[PDB]
Amino acid sequence: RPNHTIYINNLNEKIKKDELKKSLHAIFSRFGQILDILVSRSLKMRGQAFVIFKEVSSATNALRSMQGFPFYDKPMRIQYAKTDSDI
RNA sequence: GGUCACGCACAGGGCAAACCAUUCGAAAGAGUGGGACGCAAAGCCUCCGGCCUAAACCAUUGCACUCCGGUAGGUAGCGGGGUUACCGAUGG
Numbered sequence: 539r540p541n542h543t544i545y546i547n548n549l550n551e552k553i554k555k556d557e558l559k560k561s562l563h564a565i566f567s568r569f570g571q572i573l574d575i576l577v578s579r580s581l582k583m584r585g586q587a588f589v590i591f592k593e594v595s596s597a598t599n600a601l602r603s604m605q606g607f608p609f610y611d612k613p614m615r616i617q618y619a620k621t622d623s624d625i
Numbered sequence: 626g627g628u629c630a631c632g633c634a635c636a637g638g639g640c641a642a643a644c645c646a647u648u649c650g651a652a653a654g655a656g657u658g659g660g661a662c663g664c665a666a667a668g669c670c671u672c673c674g675g676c677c678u679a680a681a682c683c684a685u686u687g688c689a690c691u692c693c694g695g696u697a698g699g700u701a702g703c704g705g706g707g708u709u710a711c712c713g714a715u716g717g
């Protein structure tokens with residue numbers, strides 16, 4: 539189940555792309571090295587985020603310590619992602 | 626001369642990009658004033674395609690690393706199409 543990238547769900551869809559990036563970057567940065575944060579506001583990608591950590595241990599700590607977290611008045615739903623391509 | 630085209634001019638000229646000031650706007654962008662990159666319809670119109678914006682509303686819980694909700698607004702100086710018009714190369 540565990541993975542380098544975490545998949546963040548049920549996000550407030552009214553927050554702009556670049557404010558959400560910055561807000562996620564300042565929150566999850568303490569858990570470990572963040573490679574990139576994937577956020578877009580298209581129909582299929584609304585309310586969603588992919589936070590990529592350099593190591594799984596930091597991602598597991600990120601997933602468990604902040605699951606169900608109140609974020610812009612919405613519960614954060616964290617599960618693992620399936621395949622981190624990029625490069 | 627008319628009409629429909631056309632732009633090698635002539636002639637009166639017309640408009641105004643970027644930038645700046647200011648107003649409106651959530652934004653894209655628009656108005657007004659200065660200002661000219663250009664423009665033979667760079668006059669006018671969102672009917673079709675593209676591009677740009679996302680405040681409100683409706684819809685959407687969606688696994689991405691081409692891009693993509695409806696809607697609403699915008700660009701006519703992004704094309705196409707519609708419409709109106711000045712000059713007239715011994716002009717076609």
Ligand SMILES: Nc1nc2c(ncn2[C@@H]2O[C@@H]3COP(=O)(O)O[C@H]4[C@@H](O)[C@H](n5cnc6c(=O)[nH]c(N)nc65)O[C@@H]4COP(=O)(O)O[C@H]3[C@H]2O)c(=O)[nH]1
Pocket residue numbers: 632634639664665666667711712
């Ligand atoms: N009266 C008239 N004359 C025409 C027309 N078409 C061509 N000409 C003549 O041909 C010249 C070159 O035209 P252009 O290559 O379209 O190049 C033009 C054009 O791009 C632009 N321009 C000038 N006036 C206008 C205008 O009222 N509307 C537009 N869209 N462009 C203009 O400036 C350039 C130079 O203009 P000019 O010194 O007048 O010089 C013009 C003019 O003498 C027309 O429909 N009516």
Ligand SMILES: [Mg+2]
Pocket residue numbers: none
């Ligand atoms: Mg002249």
Ligand SMILES: [Mg+2]
Pocket residue numbers: none
């Ligand atoms: Mg002016």
Ligand SMILES: [Mg+2]
Pocket residue numbers: 665
């Ligand atoms: Mg003409």
Ligand SMILES: [Mg+2]
Pocket residue numbers: none
């Ligand atoms: Mg308009």
